[PDB]
Amino acid sequence: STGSATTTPIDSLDDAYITPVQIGTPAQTLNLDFDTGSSDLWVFSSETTASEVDGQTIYTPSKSTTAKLLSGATWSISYGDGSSSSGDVYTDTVSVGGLTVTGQAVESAKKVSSSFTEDSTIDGLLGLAFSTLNTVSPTQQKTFFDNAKASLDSPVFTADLGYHAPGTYNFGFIDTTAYTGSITYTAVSTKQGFWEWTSTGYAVGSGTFKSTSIDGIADTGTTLLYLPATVVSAYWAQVSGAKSSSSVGGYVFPCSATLPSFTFGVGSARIVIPGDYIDFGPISTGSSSCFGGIQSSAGIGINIFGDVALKAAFVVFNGATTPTLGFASK
């Protein structure tokens, strides 16, 4: 089997992408944030505290003839941005882009943190990291991809995120028309539960490539590119007037600037992020200070190849017995 679904930016900045997901019988379609940095499929629901729902579409398990309470199971997750959610668990039929999994754990939120409530466009998350990170207790549950894997034509999914435009998540096949050149594959460590890999270096604009190993994660659920402070300083030094602002929370730059590209290495291959992809717009409405799309990871503990990086590539998440990542230009 295969599946193919369009993923759509939630706003004009590409802050996140939403993909429609069918849950239950008859289907209830929710728009979920596909997150290769986490491993829970959780949804706003009829159980979510009413004051914490503000415009999201909810899953109502009592209206699904295939929903079953997973007795005793609870979940609770905290994300790298400080947000969180928790609740109980149902199993139900879940379909993405025509690919159906029966008995998928659907984690129903009883509580969500304010950042979720305040974002009416995201109805929940669909985790695509390794199932070892799934938070369901006392019986850990599998991700949608893990449940689907054995049925897929090939045990892979691909992320093709758009710049200011829709893109595609495919399951079970690699669309050879969706990229240019060849796909370069690189080793993955699953030791932390992530799609963790090592970039071979970087360049700023037309500058020379610096060969240096940068360990990080491919994370579709993170907006920006978070890299070591040395790398980030080298980038922003090429933008007149750019500076790190402790009060804003990162590098800002004059909105009048033209940003240079940023290149990262995948083996001997190179992925070029155009400068425009690094512009996240005014820090507040009407400001002439703009927020940068490349930021320091120094306070995180891990480097993160988020959407800024991934949307410059066609990305293969190869879930074979020994997982690997593939990157192609497009």
Curated annotation (Swiss-Prot):
Active site, UniProt feature: D35, S199
GO biological process: proteolysis
EC number(s) per entry: 3.4.23.22
Keyword hit for Cell membrane: no
Ranges where the Peptidase A1 domain occurs: 17-328
Catalytic activity: Hydrolysis of proteins with specificity similar to that of pepsin A, prefers hydrophobic residues at P1 and P1', but does not cleave 14-Ala-|-Leu-15 in the B chain of insulin or Z-Glu-Tyr. Clots milk
Molecular function GO labels: aspartic-type endopeptidase activity
Keywords of this entry: Aspartyl protease, Disulfide bond, Hydrolase, Protease, Signal, Zymogen
SS bond list: C255-C290
Protein family per UniProt: Belongs to the peptidase A1 family.
Protein name: Endothiapepsin
Record organism: Cryphonectria parasitica (Chestnut blight fungus)
Gene that specifies this protein: EAPA
Residues of the full protein shown: 90 to 419 of 419
